[PDB]
Amino acid sequence: MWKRMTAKAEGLYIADTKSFVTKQMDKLDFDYGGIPGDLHFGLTKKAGAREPMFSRGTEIFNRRQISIVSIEECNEIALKMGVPRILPEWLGANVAVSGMPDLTSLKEGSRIIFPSGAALLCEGENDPCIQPGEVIQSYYPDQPKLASAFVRHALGIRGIVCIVERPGAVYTGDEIEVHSYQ
Amino acid sequence: MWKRMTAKAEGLYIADTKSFVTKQMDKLDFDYGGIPGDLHFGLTKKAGAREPMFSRGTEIFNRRQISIVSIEECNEIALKMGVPRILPEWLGANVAVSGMPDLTSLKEGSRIIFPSGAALLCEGENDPCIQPGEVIQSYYPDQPKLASAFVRHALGIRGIVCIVERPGAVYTGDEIEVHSYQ
Ligand SMILES: [Cl-]
Ligand SMILES: [Cl-]
Ligand SMILES: [Cl-]
C-alpha cells in the first residue's frame, strides 16, 4: 500500500510577512507546526472559507502547515491560462517539486521525506481560491479575467498541503523520497 | 464538496492504562493531541509498523489521536468471524457511532462535529493488526485462530482514526454532525 518514488525539491520559499506571496530561501526548517517564522506556522489557525463547517475565525488545528506545488503542474496551469509562466511564489508555495507531474493526486496519508529525515504528511489537495488568481493577474494586467481563469484551470493541478510529521532541515535541490499511499 | 449527514455517539471510551483496551466513559474531553489521560494522547507518537517509512521508535506527529468504529461494522466483523459480538473496547476504540453506513469509508478531510463544537478531522482507515485479534481470542477461548481471522475479516471495516481539530467535551448519546468529504 506504499509505492516509493524519487523526486526533487526545486525550490523552497517562506512567507515571512503578512503577504502570502513567498520568497525563495536556500534552506528551511521544518518543525511541528510548519516553518518557524512562516505565515502559516503554528499548532492552530483561524477557520475560513476552506473550513466552512466552522464559524469564520474559530480557532482550529492547523492542518495546512506546508504548501507544495510541482513545476510540471504550474507549467500546466500557465498553458491553460495562456500565460508564459506561473511562479510557485505567486501561489504561496513553500516547496516547489519537480518529477511529480501528478502531484495533486498524491493521496492523503502519503509521505514526502527529505535527506535530513524531515518528513511531510500529505493532507490532500489544495483547493484554488481567487487570491492567487488576482496575484497572477497583476503580472499580466493586459490579459482579461485571469483571476477567474486561475480558479477554473488550476482545479486538480494546484498542488497539496501537508503537516510536518518529522522535524528537520530541507535544502534547495534536495532529492526527496515519496511514499505514495494506496 | 461536502455532504452533511447525522449520526450518533453510542459510546465513548478511554484507555487509562498501558493496555489499548478501552473502558466506557459518560464524558470525554477532546483537546489537541486527543483525550488527555488516554494511552494515545499527545502531539507526537513513536513510529511503528503502521508508519514503515520511519525506523521503529522514531518520534513523529500523532495523526492517530482518536479511533472511531461504528456499531454496524463491529456487528459485521462479528458475523464474518462467527462470534456473538465484537466490542469497541476490544478494538481500543474511543468512539462508537451508529446511524452512518460504511463508517470506515469516510474520506480523509471529513469532519465529525459534536454539540459542544468539539470536532474531529478524519485521517482515514484504521488498518487492523494482530493485537485486538488476540484480545478477541481471549474472550472466545473455544474459538480457533480468532486473532488471524480478525486481521482477515476486519479489513476495510475496522473504523477510522482522527486528529482533534477543535477542543471540546463530548457525551454519550451526543448527536453528531458529519461533513463527508467529496
Ligand atoms: Cl461557535
Ligand atoms: Cl489558492
Ligand atoms: Cl488494530
Side-chain angles (χ1 to χ4, degrees):
Chain A
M1 56 180 257
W2 291 115
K3 65 173 173 178
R4 289 168 300 184
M5 56 191 89
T6 297
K8 176 180 181 183
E10 292 288 355
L12 303 178
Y13 320 81
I14 190 176
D16 62 307
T17 68
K18 292 61 61 179
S19 170
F20 71 68
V21 171
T22 55
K23 59 181 60 176
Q24 193 164 16
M25 300 290 285
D26 69 304
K27 161 200 178 181
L28 289 180
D29 288 309
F30 284 170
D31 196 352
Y32 297 121
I35 300 161
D38 180 75
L39 178 61
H40 298 96
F41 178 69
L43 170 68
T44 65
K45 64 161 292 182
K46 299 173 186 176
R50 293 177 181 292
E51 309 86 9
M53 64 284 300
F54 298 106
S55 295
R56 181 176 294 293
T58 302
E59 183 174 62
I60 58 181
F61 173 72
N62 178 23
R63 180 195 193 209
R64 298 163 57 83
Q65 292 169 26
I66 302 292
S67 178
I68 308 180
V69 300
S70 89
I71 296 301
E72 294 85 22
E73 296 191 321
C74 283
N75 287 172
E76 209 180 321
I77 294 176
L79 268 60
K80 297 174 66 182
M81 291 181 74
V83 297
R85 58 174 178 176
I86 293 295
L87 302 182
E89 296 99 311
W90 304 346
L91 304 178
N94 296 298
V95 185
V97 302
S98 66
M100 301 191 73
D102 289 301
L103 171 69
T104 302
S105 295
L106 188 66
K107 295 176 182 173
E108 291 87 335
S110 296
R111 268 73 166 201
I112 297 176
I113 305 183
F114 291 76
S116 67
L120 299 180
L121 169 67
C122 183
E123 285 294 319
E125 303 186 10
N126 186 17
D127 189 57
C129 296
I130 202 73
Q131 300 301 59
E134 302 182 302
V135 172
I136 294 170
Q137 176 72 83
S138 69
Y139 285 99
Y140 304 117
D142 67 316
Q143 297 186 56
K145 307 181 179 62
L146 290 189
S148 59
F150 171 75
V151 177
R152 179 188 184 185
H153 293 117
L155 182 62
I157 56 179
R158 193 237 179 289
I160 63 181
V161 283
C162 302
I163 278 171
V164 174
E165 185 164 23
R166 193 186 185 189
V170 295
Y171 310 90
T172 304
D174 271 357
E175 201 177 68
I176 54 174
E177 190 77 356
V178 180
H179 298 266
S180 193
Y181 180 65
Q182 309 301 170
Chain B
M1 187 176 102
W2 304 95
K3 177 186 179 183
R4 311 183 201 67
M5 317 173 116
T6 299
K8 180 181 177 189
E10 294 291 355
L12 299 178
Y13 319 78
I14 191 177
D16 69 326
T17 75
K18 293 185 178 182
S19 171
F20 64 72
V21 179
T22 54
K23 70 174 179 181
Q24 174 172 24
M25 291 296 271
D26 181 55
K27 168 194 178 177
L28 290 181
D29 287 302
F30 285 170
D31 195 16
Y32 301 115
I35 301 157
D38 177 73
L39 177 67
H40 303 104
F41 179 75
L43 294 177
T44 66
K45 73 183 291 290
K46 299 299 179 178
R50 295 174 184 290
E51 307 91 356
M53 63 287 301
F54 300 107
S55 66
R56 196 183 188 70
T58 299
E59 180 175 53
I60 59 173
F61 171 74
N62 183 19
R63 74 187 289 236
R64 295 171 59 79
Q65 297 173 17
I66 303 287
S67 66
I68 305 178
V69 300
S70 68
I71 295 301
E72 299 93 336
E73 290 184 320
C74 283
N75 280 341
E76 183 179 358
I77 294 172
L79 248 56
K80 296 171 64 184
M81 291 185 76
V83 295
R85 50 193 298 155
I86 293 290
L87 297 187
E89 296 97 306
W90 303 343
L91 307 188
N94 299 119
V95 184
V97 304
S98 67
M100 181 174 84
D102 309 315
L103 165 74
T104 298
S105 294
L106 188 66
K107 302 297 181 175
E108 289 89 333
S110 296
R111 266 70 170 202
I112 295 177
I113 304 179
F114 292 75
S116 68
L120 301 182
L121 167 67
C122 185
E123 284 294 320
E125 197 175 330
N126 188 11
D127 212 8
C129 77
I130 204 69
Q131 289 86 317
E134 301 179 306
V135 169
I136 298 173
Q137 176 72 83
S138 76
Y139 277 102
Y140 298 115
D142 60 299
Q143 295 281 170
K145 306 175 181 180
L146 288 189
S148 57
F150 170 68
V151 178
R152 186 204 321 163
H153 300 300
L155 185 59
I157 60 175
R158 192 236 177 293
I160 60 175
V161 283
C162 304
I163 57 175
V164 172
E165 181 163 31
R166 192 189 183 188
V170 295
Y171 307 87
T172 299
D174 270 352
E175 171 184 57
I176 54 171
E177 179 187 66
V178 178
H179 297 272
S180 191
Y181 182 68
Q182 188 188 62

CSV table of all heavy atoms in Angstrom, one decimal, chain A residues 37-84:
chain,number,residue,atom,x,y,z
A,37,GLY,N,8.6,31.1,11.8
A,37,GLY,CA,8.7,32.4,11.2
A,37,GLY,C,7.8,32.5,9.9
A,37,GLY,O,7.7,33.6,9.4
A,38,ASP,N,7.2,31.4,9.5
A,38,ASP,CA,6.4,31.5,8.3
A,38,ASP,C,4.9,31.9,8.6
A,38,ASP,O,4.5,31.7,9.8
A,38,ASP,CB,6.3,30.1,7.7
A,38,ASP,CG,5.4,30.1,6.4
A,38,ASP,OD1,5.9,30.6,5.4
A,38,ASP,OD2,4.3,29.5,6.5
A,39,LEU,N,4.2,32.5,7.7
A,39,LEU,CA,2.9,32.9,7.8
A,39,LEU,C,1.9,31.9,8.3
A,39,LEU,O,0.9,32.2,9.0
A,39,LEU,CB,2.4,33.5,6.5
A,39,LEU,CG,0.9,34.1,6.5
A,39,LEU,CD1,0.7,35.2,7.5
A,39,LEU,CD2,0.6,34.6,5.1
A,40,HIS,N,2.1,30.6,7.9
A,40,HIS,CA,1.2,29.5,8.3
A,40,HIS,C,1.7,28.6,9.3
A,40,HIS,O,1.3,27.5,9.5
A,40,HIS,CB,0.8,28.7,7.0
A,40,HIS,CG,0.1,29.5,6.0
A,40,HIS,ND1,0.7,30.1,4.9
A,40,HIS,CD2,-1.2,29.9,5.9
A,40,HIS,CE1,-0.2,30.8,4.2
A,40,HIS,NE2,-1.4,30.7,4.8
A,41,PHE,N,2.7,29.1,10.1
A,41,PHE,CA,3.3,28.2,11.2
A,41,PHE,C,2.4,28.2,12.4
A,41,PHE,O,1.9,29.3,12.8
A,41,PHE,CB,4.7,28.8,11.6
A,41,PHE,CG,5.4,28.0,12.7
A,41,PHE,CD1,5.8,26.7,12.5
A,41,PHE,CD2,5.5,28.7,13.9
A,41,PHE,CE1,6.4,26.0,13.6
A,41,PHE,CE2,6.1,28.0,15.0
A,41,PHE,CZ,6.6,26.6,14.8
A,42,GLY,N,2.4,27.1,13.1
A,42,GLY,CA,1.6,27.0,14.3
A,42,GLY,C,0.7,25.8,14.5
A,42,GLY,O,0.4,25.1,13.6
A,43,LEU,N,0.4,25.6,15.8
A,43,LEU,CA,-0.5,24.4,16.2
A,43,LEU,C,-1.9,24.7,15.7
A,43,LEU,O,-2.6,23.8,15.3
A,43,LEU,CB,-0.5,24.3,17.7
A,43,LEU,CG,-1.4,23.3,18.3
A,43,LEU,CD1,-1.1,21.9,17.9
A,43,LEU,CD2,-1.4,23.4,19.8
A,44,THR,N,-2.3,26.0,15.7
A,44,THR,CA,-3.7,26.3,15.4
A,44,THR,C,-3.7,27.4,14.3
A,44,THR,O,-2.7,28.0,13.9
A,44,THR,CB,-4.5,26.8,16.6
A,44,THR,OG1,-3.9,28.0,17.0
A,44,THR,CG2,-4.4,25.8,17.7
A,45,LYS,N,-5.0,27.6,13.8
A,45,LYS,CA,-5.2,28.6,12.8
A,45,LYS,C,-6.7,29.0,12.9
A,45,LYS,O,-7.4,28.4,13.6
A,45,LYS,CB,-5.0,28.1,11.4
A,45,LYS,CG,-6.0,26.9,11.0
A,45,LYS,CD,-6.1,26.7,9.5
A,45,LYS,CE,-6.7,28.0,8.8
A,45,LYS,NZ,-6.8,27.8,7.4
A,46,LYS,N,-7.1,30.1,12.3
A,46,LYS,CA,-8.4,30.6,12.3
A,46,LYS,C,-9.2,30.0,11.1
A,46,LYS,O,-8.7,30.1,10.0
A,46,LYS,CB,-8.5,32.1,12.3
A,46,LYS,CG,-7.7,32.8,13.5
A,46,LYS,CD,-7.7,34.3,13.3
A,46,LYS,CE,-6.8,34.9,14.4
A,46,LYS,NZ,-6.6,36.4,14.3
A,47,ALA,N,-10.4,29.5,11.4
A,47,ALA,CA,-11.2,28.9,10.3
A,47,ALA,C,-11.6,30.0,9.3
A,47,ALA,O,-11.8,31.1,9.6
A,47,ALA,CB,-12.4,28.3,10.9
A,48,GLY,N,-11.7,29.6,8.0
A,48,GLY,CA,-12.1,30.5,7.0
A,48,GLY,C,-12.9,29.7,5.9
A,48,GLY,O,-13.6,28.8,6.2
A,49,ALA,N,-12.8,30.2,4.7
A,49,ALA,CA,-13.6,29.6,3.6
A,49,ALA,C,-13.2,28.2,3.3
A,49,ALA,O,-14.0,27.4,2.8
A,49,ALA,CB,-13.4,30.5,2.4
A,50,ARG,N,-12.0,27.8,3.7
A,50,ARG,CA,-11.5,26.4,3.4
A,50,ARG,C,-12.1,25.5,4.4
A,50,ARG,O,-12.2,24.3,4.2
A,50,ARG,CB,-10.0,26.4,3.5
A,50,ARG,CG,-9.4,27.1,2.3
A,50,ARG,CD,-7.9,27.1,2.4
A,50,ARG,NE,-7.2,27.8,1.4
A,50,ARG,CZ,-7.2,27.4,0.1
A,50,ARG,NH1,-7.8,26.3,-0.3
A,50,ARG,NH2,-6.5,28.2,-0.8
A,51,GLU,N,-12.5,26.0,5.6
A,51,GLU,CA,-13.1,25.1,6.6
A,51,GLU,C,-14.5,25.7,6.9
A,51,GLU,O,-14.8,26.2,8.0
A,51,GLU,CB,-12.3,25.1,7.9
A,51,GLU,CG,-10.8,24.8,7.7
A,51,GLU,CD,-10.0,26.0,7.3
A,51,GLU,OE1,-10.5,27.2,7.4
A,51,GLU,OE2,-8.8,25.9,7.0
A,52,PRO,N,-15.5,25.6,5.9
A,52,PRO,CA,-16.8,26.1,6.1
A,52,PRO,C,-17.7,25.5,7.2
A,52,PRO,O,-18.7,26.1,7.5
A,52,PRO,CB,-17.4,25.9,4.7
A,52,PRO,CG,-16.7,24.6,4.2
A,52,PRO,CD,-15.3,24.9,4.7
A,53,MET,N,-17.3,24.4,7.7
A,53,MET,CA,-18.1,23.8,8.8
A,53,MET,C,-17.9,24.4,10.1
A,53,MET,O,-18.6,24.1,11.1
A,53,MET,CB,-17.8,22.3,8.9
A,53,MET,CG,-16.4,21.9,9.3
A,53,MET,SD,-15.0,22.1,7.9
A,53,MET,CE,-15.8,20.8,6.7
A,54,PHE,N,-17.0,25.4,10.2
A,54,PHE,CA,-16.7,26.1,11.4
A,54,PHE,C,-17.1,27.6,11.2
A,54,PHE,O,-17.1,28.1,10.0
A,54,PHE,CB,-15.2,26.1,11.7
A,54,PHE,CG,-14.7,24.7,12.0
A,54,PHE,CD1,-13.9,24.0,11.1
A,54,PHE,CD2,-15.1,24.0,13.2
A,54,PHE,CE1,-13.5,22.7,11.4
A,54,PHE,CE2,-14.6,22.7,13.5
A,54,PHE,CZ,-13.8,22.1,12.6
A,55,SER,N,-17.4,28.3,12.2
A,55,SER,CA,-17.7,29.7,12.1
A,55,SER,C,-16.4,30.4,11.8
A,55,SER,O,-15.3,30.1,12.4
A,55,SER,CB,-18.2,30.3,13.5
A,55,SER,OG,-19.5,29.6,13.8
A,56,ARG,N,-16.4,31.4,10.9
A,56,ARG,CA,-15.3,32.1,10.5
A,56,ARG,C,-14.6,32.7,11.7
A,56,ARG,O,-15.2,33.2,12.6
A,56,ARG,CB,-15.7,33.3,9.5
A,56,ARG,CG,-14.5,34.1,9.0
A,56,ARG,CD,-15.0,35.1,8.0
A,56,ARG,NE,-15.5,34.5,6.8
A,56,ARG,CZ,-14.7,33.9,5.9
A,56,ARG,NH1,-13.4,33.7,6.1
A,56,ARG,NH2,-15.2,33.3,4.8
A,57,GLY,N,-13.2,32.5,11.8
A,57,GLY,CA,-12.5,32.9,12.9
A,57,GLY,C,-12.3,32.0,14.0
A,57,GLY,O,-11.5,32.2,15.0
A,58,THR,N,-13.0,30.8,14.0
A,58,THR,CA,-12.9,29.8,15.1
A,58,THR,C,-11.5,29.2,15.1
A,58,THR,O,-11.0,28.9,14.0
A,58,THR,CB,-13.9,28.7,14.8
A,58,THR,OG1,-15.3,29.2,14.7
A,58,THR,CG2,-13.9,27.6,15.9
A,59,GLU,N,-10.9,29.1,16.3
A,59,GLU,CA,-9.6,28.5,16.4
A,59,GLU,C,-9.7,27.0,16.2
A,59,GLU,O,-10.4,26.4,17.0
A,59,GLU,CB,-9.0,28.9,17.7
A,59,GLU,CG,-7.5,28.4,17.8
A,59,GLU,CD,-6.8,28.8,19.1
A,59,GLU,OE1,-7.3,28.5,20.2
A,59,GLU,OE2,-5.8,29.5,19.0
A,60,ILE,N,-8.9,26.5,15.2
A,60,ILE,CA,-8.9,25.1,15.0
A,60,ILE,C,-7.5,24.6,14.7
A,60,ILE,O,-6.6,25.5,14.6
A,60,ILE,CB,-9.7,24.7,13.7
A,60,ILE,CG1,-9.2,25.5,12.5
A,60,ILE,CG2,-11.2,25.0,13.9
A,60,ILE,CD1,-9.9,25.2,11.2
A,61,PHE,N,-7.3,23.3,14.7
A,61,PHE,CA,-6.0,22.8,14.5
A,61,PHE,C,-5.5,23.2,13.1
A,61,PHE,O,-6.2,23.3,12.1
A,61,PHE,CB,-6.0,21.3,14.5
A,61,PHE,CG,-4.7,20.6,14.1
A,61,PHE,CD1,-3.6,20.7,14.9
A,61,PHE,CD2,-4.6,20.0,12.9
A,61,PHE,CE1,-2.4,20.1,14.6
A,61,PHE,CE2,-3.4,19.4,12.5
A,61,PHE,CZ,-2.3,19.5,13.3
A,62,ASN,N,-4.2,23.5,13.0
A,62,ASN,CA,-3.6,24.0,11.7
A,62,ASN,C,-3.1,22.8,10.9
A,62,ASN,O,-2.0,22.3,11.0
A,62,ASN,CB,-2.4,24.9,12.0
A,62,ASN,CG,-1.7,25.4,10.7
A,62,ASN,OD1,-2.3,25.4,9.6
A,62,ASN,ND2,-0.5,25.8,10.8
A,63,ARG,N,-4.0,22.4,10.0
A,63,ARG,CA,-3.8,21.3,9.1
A,63,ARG,C,-3.0,21.7,7.8
A,63,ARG,O,-2.3,20.8,7.2
A,63,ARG,CB,-5.2,20.8,8.6
A,63,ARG,CG,-5.2,19.6,7.7
A,63,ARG,CD,-6.6,19.5,7.1
A,63,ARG,NE,-6.7,18.2,6.4
A,63,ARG,CZ,-7.5,18.0,5.3
A,63,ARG,NH1,-8.2,19.0,4.8
A,63,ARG,NH2,-7.5,16.8,4.8
A,64,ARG,N,-3.1,22.9,7.4
A,64,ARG,CA,-2.3,23.4,6.3
A,64,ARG,C,-1.0,24.1,6.7
A,64,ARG,O,-0.9,25.3,6.5
A,64,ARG,CB,-3.2,24.4,5.5
A,64,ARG,CG,-4.5,23.8,5.0
A,64,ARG,CD,-5.6,24.8,4.6
A,64,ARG,NE,-5.1,25.7,3.6
A,64,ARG,CZ,-5.0,25.5,2.3
A,64,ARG,NH1,-5.5,24.4,1.8
A,64,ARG,NH2,-4.5,26.4,1.5
A,65,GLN,N,-0.1,23.3,7.1
A,65,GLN,CA,1.2,23.8,7.6
A,65,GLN,C,2.2,24.1,6.5
A,65,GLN,O,3.0,25.0,6.5
A,65,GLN,CB,1.8,22.8,8.6
A,65,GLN,CG,1.1,22.7,9.9
A,65,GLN,CD,1.5,21.6,10.8
A,65,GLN,OE1,2.7,21.1,10.7
A,65,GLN,NE2,0.6,21.1,11.6
A,66,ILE,N,2.2,23.2,5.5
A,66,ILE,CA,3.2,23.4,4.3
A,66,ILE,C,2.4,23.2,3.0
A,66,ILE,O,1.6,22.3,2.8
A,66,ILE,CB,4.3,22.3,4.4
A,66,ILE,CG1,5.0,22.3,5.7
A,66,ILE,CG2,5.2,22.4,3.2
A,66,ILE,CD1,5.9,23.6,5.9
A,67,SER,N,2.7,24.1,2.1
A,67,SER,CA,2.1,24.1,0.8
A,67,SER,C,3.1,23.7,-0.3
A,67,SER,O,4.2,24.2,-0.3
A,67,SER,CB,1.5,25.5,0.4
A,67,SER,OG,1.0,25.5,-0.8
A,68,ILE,N,2.7,22.7,-1.1
A,68,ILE,CA,3.6,22.2,-2.1
A,68,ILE,C,3.0,22.2,-3.5
A,68,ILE,O,1.8,21.9,-3.7
A,68,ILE,CB,4.0,20.7,-1.9
A,68,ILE,CG1,4.5,20.5,-0.4
A,68,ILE,CG2,5.0,20.3,-2.9
A,68,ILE,CD1,5.0,19.1,-0.1
A,69,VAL,N,3.8,22.6,-4.5
A,69,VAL,CA,3.3,22.6,-5.9
A,69,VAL,C,4.4,22.0,-6.7
A,69,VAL,O,5.6,21.9,-6.3
A,69,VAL,CB,3.1,24.1,-6.5
A,69,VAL,CG1,2.0,24.8,-5.6
A,69,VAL,CG2,4.4,24.9,-6.4
A,70,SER,N,4.1,21.5,-7.9
A,70,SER,CA,5.1,20.8,-8.7
A,70,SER,C,5.3,21.8,-9.9
A,70,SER,O,4.4,22.4,-10.4
A,70,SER,CB,4.7,19.5,-9.2
A,70,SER,OG,3.9,19.5,-10.4
A,71,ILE,N,6.5,21.9,-10.4
A,71,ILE,CA,6.9,22.7,-11.5
A,71,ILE,C,6.1,22.3,-12.7
A,71,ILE,O,5.6,23.1,-13.5
A,71,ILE,CB,8.4,22.6,-11.9
A,71,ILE,CG1,9.3,23.1,-10.7
A,71,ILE,CG2,8.7,23.3,-13.2
A,71,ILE,CD1,9.0,24.5,-10.4
A,72,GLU,N,5.9,21.0,-12.9
A,72,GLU,CA,5.1,20.4,-14.0
A,72,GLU,C,3.7,20.9,-14.0
A,72,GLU,O,3.2,21.4,-15.1
A,72,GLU,CB,5.1,18.9,-14.0
A,72,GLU,CG,6.5,18.2,-14.3
A,72,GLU,CD,7.3,18.1,-13.0
A,72,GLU,OE1,6.7,18.1,-11.9
A,72,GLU,OE2,8.6,18.0,-13.1
A,73,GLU,N,3.0,20.8,-12.9
A,73,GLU,CA,1.6,21.3,-12.8
A,73,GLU,C,1.5,22.8,-13.0
A,73,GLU,O,0.5,23.3,-13.5
A,73,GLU,CB,1.0,20.8,-11.5
A,73,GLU,CG,0.8,19.3,-11.4
A,73,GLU,CD,0.0,18.8,-10.3
A,73,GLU,OE1,0.0,19.4,-9.2
A,73,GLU,OE2,-0.8,17.8,-10.5
A,74,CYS,N,2.5,23.6,-12.5
A,74,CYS,CA,2.5,25.0,-12.6
A,74,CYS,C,2.5,25.4,-14.1
A,74,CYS,O,1.9,26.3,-14.5
A,74,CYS,CB,3.6,25.7,-11.8
A,74,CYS,SG,3.4,25.7,-10.0
A,75,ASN,N,3.4,24.7,-14.8
A,75,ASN,CA,3.5,24.9,-16.2
A,75,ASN,C,2.2,24.6,-16.9
A,75,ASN,O,1.8,25.2,-17.9
A,75,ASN,CB,4.6,24.0,-16.8
A,75,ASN,CG,6.0,24.5,-16.4
A,75,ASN,OD1,7.0,23.8,-16.7
A,75,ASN,ND2,6.1,25.6,-15.8
A,76,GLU,N,1.5,23.6,-16.4
A,76,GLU,CA,0.2,23.1,-16.9
A,76,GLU,C,-0.8,24.2,-16.8
A,76,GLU,O,-1.6,24.5,-17.7
A,76,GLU,CB,-0.2,21.9,-16.3
A,76,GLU,CG,-1.1,21.0,-17.1
A,76,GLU,CD,-1.6,19.7,-16.4
A,76,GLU,OE1,-0.8,19.1,-15.7
A,76,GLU,OE2,-2.7,19.3,-16.6
A,77,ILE,N,-0.8,24.9,-15.6
A,77,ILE,CA,-1.7,26.0,-15.3
A,77,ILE,C,-1.4,27.1,-16.3
A,77,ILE,O,-2.3,27.7,-16.9
A,77,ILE,CB,-1.6,26.5,-13.8
A,77,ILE,CG1,-2.0,25.4,-12.8
A,77,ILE,CG2,-2.4,27.7,-13.6
A,77,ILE,CD1,-1.8,25.8,-11.4
A,78,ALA,N,-0.1,27.4,-16.4
A,78,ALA,CA,0.3,28.5,-17.3
A,78,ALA,C,-0.3,28.3,-18.7
A,78,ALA,O,-0.9,29.2,-19.3
A,78,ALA,CB,1.8,28.6,-17.4
A,79,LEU,N,-0.1,27.1,-19.2
A,79,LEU,CA,-0.6,26.8,-20.6
A,79,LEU,C,-2.1,27.0,-20.7
A,79,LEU,O,-2.6,27.7,-21.6
A,79,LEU,CB,-0.3,25.4,-21.0
A,79,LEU,CG,1.0,25.2,-21.8
A,79,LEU,CD1,2.2,25.7,-20.9
A,79,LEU,CD2,1.2,23.8,-22.1
A,80,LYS,N,-2.9,26.5,-19.7
A,80,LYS,CA,-4.3,26.6,-19.7
A,80,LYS,C,-4.8,28.0,-19.6
A,80,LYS,O,-5.8,28.4,-20.1
A,80,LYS,CB,-4.9,25.7,-18.6
A,80,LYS,CG,-4.6,24.2,-18.7
A,80,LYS,CD,-5.1,23.4,-17.6
A,80,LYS,CE,-6.6,23.4,-17.4
A,80,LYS,NZ,-7.0,22.6,-16.2
A,81,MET,N,-4.0,28.9,-18.9
A,81,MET,CA,-4.4,30.3,-18.7
A,81,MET,C,-3.9,31.1,-19.8
A,81,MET,O,-4.3,32.3,-20.0
A,81,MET,CB,-3.8,30.8,-17.4
A,81,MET,CG,-4.5,30.2,-16.1
A,81,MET,SD,-3.7,31.0,-14.6
A,81,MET,CE,-4.6,32.7,-14.7
A,82,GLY,N,-3.0,30.6,-20.7
A,82,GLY,CA,-2.5,31.4,-21.8
A,82,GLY,C,-1.4,32.4,-21.4
A,82,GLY,O,-1.2,33.4,-22.0
A,83,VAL,N,-0.7,32.1,-20.3
A,83,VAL,CA,0.4,33.0,-19.8
A,83,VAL,C,1.7,32.3,-19.9
A,83,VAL,O,1.8,31.0,-19.8
A,83,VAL,CB,0.1,33.5,-18.3
A,83,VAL,CG1,-1.1,34.3,-18.3
A,83,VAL,CG2,0.1,32.3,-17.4
A,84,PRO,N,2.8,33.0,-20.1
A,84,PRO,CA,4.2,32.5,-20.2
A,84,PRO,C,4.7,31.7,-19.0
A,84,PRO,O,5.4,30.7,-19.2
A,84,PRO,CB,5.0,33.7,-20.5
A,84,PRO,CG,4.3,34.8,-19.8
A,84,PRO,CD,2.8,34.5,-20.1
